[PDB]
Design a binder for this molecule. Sequence first.
Ligand code: A1BRP
Ligand code: ZN
Length: 139
Amino acid sequence: SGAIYVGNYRVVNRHLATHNDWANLVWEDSSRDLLVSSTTAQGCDTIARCDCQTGVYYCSSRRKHYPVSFSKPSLIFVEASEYYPARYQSHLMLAVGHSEPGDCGGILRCQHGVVGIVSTGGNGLVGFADVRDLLWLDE
Ligand SMILES: NC(=O)[C@H]1CCCN(C(=O)Cc2cc(F)ccc2Cl)C1
Ligand SMILES: [Zn+2]
């Protein structure tokens, strides 16, 4: 669980979106595992606009933050689940680091701000759905 709040936006993993997020939909993309919904109050997260490859993510299964090097956003094959058939998930960045199914929603961030959220993982790897290209979150 976990979301990014930037202005009147709520960014969540599309597979964990609620009835409320779908009834207030702005944008959603199954290929990225992302869903953005409208909120009434103001959100104060800063989104990073950069090409950083180092940062810190929160791992809720360990109740700890961890520093990682992560790859550049790309199309990576993701094993079938109860939410999706087997497919390439776009805009994904991988890191060596601990991850568990309930860790989805944990924020990844660099000195510039929010980079993305935990979306995939397994075998000592952790995958993050990137949000730095979503320029419209700012405006
Ligand atoms: N983005 C997706 O399609 C997700 C949907 C939920 C399932 N999923 C995972 O990777 C689950 C997972 C397994 C594991 F061994 C360690 C961490 C995680 Cl996040 C793919
Ligand atoms: Zn950065």
